Design an enzyme around this catalytic site. Structure first.
Site, PDB file in Angstrom:
ATOM      1  N   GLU A 234     -61.815 -94.932  44.154  1.00  0.00           N
ATOM      2  CA  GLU A 234     -60.913 -95.595  45.065  1.00  0.00           C
ATOM      3  C   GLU A 234     -59.502 -95.099  44.747  1.00  0.00           C
ATOM      4  O   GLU A 234     -59.036 -95.257  43.616  1.00  0.00           O
ATOM      5  CB  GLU A 234     -61.037 -97.114  44.870  1.00  0.00           C
ATOM      6  CG  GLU A 234     -60.176 -97.956  45.795  1.00  0.00           C
ATOM      7  CD  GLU A 234     -60.253 -97.516  47.243  1.00  0.00           C
ATOM      8  OE1 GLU A 234     -59.248 -96.981  47.744  1.00  0.00           O
ATOM      9  OE2 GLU A 234     -61.309 -97.697  47.878  1.00  0.00           O
TER      10      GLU A 234
ATOM     11  N   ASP B  91     -68.268 -95.237  51.635  1.00  0.00           N
ATOM     12  CA  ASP B  91     -67.496 -95.940  52.685  1.00  0.00           C
ATOM     13  C   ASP B  91     -66.486 -94.988  53.320  1.00  0.00           C
ATOM     14  O   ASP B  91     -65.459 -94.654  52.705  1.00  0.00           O
ATOM     15  CB  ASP B  91     -66.714 -97.104  52.093  1.00  0.00           C
ATOM     16  CG  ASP B  91     -67.583 -98.327  51.822  1.00  0.00           C
ATOM     17  OD1 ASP B  91     -68.104 -98.931  52.790  1.00  0.00           O
ATOM     18  OD2 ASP B  91     -67.727 -98.705  50.638  1.00  0.00           O
TER      19      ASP B  91
END
Lengths: 276, 276
Positions: free
Chosen positions: A114, A163
């Site tokens: 991330e 994602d």
């Protein structure tokens, strides 16, 4: 993007998209709204959907729906693989995929890429039940350049989830019976894009299939999922082992199960046509 | 309900519903907007969804999506029944269910109860490909009080379909291996209402099941379908006969097929819980 007590998820063409439509949530009060060095990050308590996280004007998670797409995107590859021990999540700032991955006891270590640390903090503060797993000892967090990471980590991963030739990187990062799961757009909106994506992966992986499920707060209401396997004998559309009524409740699954697993790959006609 | 070149499908609580959200379509130009003696009837050409029909502020049909819910609501009972000859459609003013019913050669006569003749005309004028079947010799149209109709027509119908004790009326209207199909709300919004409906029909019919599918322009993106059979041995979840690749294309099916048929009944965990 906030108006008369109403937030509206417009398509980016506002001067990969969903032009000519938009979906709106009623706002009780804003709870946060800063710009990080990457994206506009906004969270608000909504009248009927609880706290909702929006990134760059795109809804990401809702407290009302904390589970549907995350259960599918994580549990599809996880249960299809026969002993997933090493897992990589690309994206996942909100925590939902991580939460679901940690339910698999076979996992020894799970790495997550991330870039935007502000998304993680927001999620920690405003979205619990989505972000419990950020303290787990199995979580190896990484905020680096994720492409270089993947270049230097070949044959490490049983399962990669993203994602969303990058897909060649992904292929090499996987071990030999590795399975890949990627967020797969809308069959209502990006069918030529889905057709394109499936086609090039059939060049890269010996087995490429496309499942889908309902997801309320997603544009037009169904998210798709791209699933590719390195071993040509892996049928990703039947899980390795099959869950009983009690195993499901043990696992606090609200959307996913073996039967649902299998059916998510039975595609509607117009979708089945465009993928041939 | 038209604003800044944008139509917004608000929930009726605007001073069975979907409070706290709304879906919007971009308008090119209005094409019609009158009040009949029953409902506000509005059709417009939209930027990206073609002509759309809205009744009392609720989207009913779109040219972009002319087929998905129609194919499911009609073809589920139709192919589950082993020789449907006599069929009744309650609702259906737009024409879409009728179009799909007429694809079944076994049909001898099909009766439709639509109160609002203005909806039929609108659909004829502004929505072709939805309303071709209004000239078919098998169509018996009726604009009367539909409750009295059902009281006087016992044991006539192999298949009743409704665009929505009452359900006792329907049971008596059906012949002996009769199958019933009803528009079945949203699992995202009306689960206690769906639970209630399924429960009372299990009092009335020896077999009651609930399937669902994706539908883009429906609130939150999935419509459900309630399917009840008079014969306790009818398994409505496996069609009587099973369609080949060519039978499908012959029938111009864009959403529905035997595999899809079956999978629409494989419910997500949270839906499966609430129906026990």
């Amino acid at each position: 993007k906030l108006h008369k007590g109403w937030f509206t998820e417009f398509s980016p063409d506002d001067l990969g998209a969903w032009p000519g439509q938009a979906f709106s949530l009623q706002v009780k009060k804003v709870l946060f709204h800063e710009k990080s060095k990457y994206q506009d990050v906004l969270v608000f308590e909504s009248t009927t959907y609880g706290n909702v996280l929006v990134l760059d004007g795109i809804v990401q998670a809702t407290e009302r729906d904390e589970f549907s797409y995350q259960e599918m995107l994580a549990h599809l590859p996880m249960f299809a693989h026969p002993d997933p021990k090493r897992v990589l999540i690309i994206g996942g700032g909100d925590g939902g995929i991580l939460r679901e991955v940690l339910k698999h006891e076979s996992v020894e270590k799970v790495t997550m890429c991330e870039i935007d640390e502000m998304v993680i903090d927001v999620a920690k503060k405003f979205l619990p039940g989505m972000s419990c797993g950020f303290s787990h000892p199995k979580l190896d967090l990484f905020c680096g350049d994720g492409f270089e990471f993947l270049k230097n980590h070949k044959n490490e991963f049983d399962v990669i989830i993203t994602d969303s030739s990058y897909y060649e990187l992904l292929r090499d990062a996987l071990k030999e019976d590795g399975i890949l799961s990627s967020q797969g757009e809308s069959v209502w909106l990006h069918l030529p894009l889905i057709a394109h994506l499936v086609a090039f992966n059939r060049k890269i992986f010996p087995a490429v299939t496309y499942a889908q499920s309902i997801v309320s707060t997603y544009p037009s209401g169904s998210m798709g999922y791209l699933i590719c396997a390195k071993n040509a004998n892996r049928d990703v559309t039947t899980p390795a082992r099959t869950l009983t009524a009690e195993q499901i409740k043990a696992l606090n699954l609200r959307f996913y199960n073996s039967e649902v697993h299998k059916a998510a790959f039975v595609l509607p006609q117009f979708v089945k046509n465009a993928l041939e």
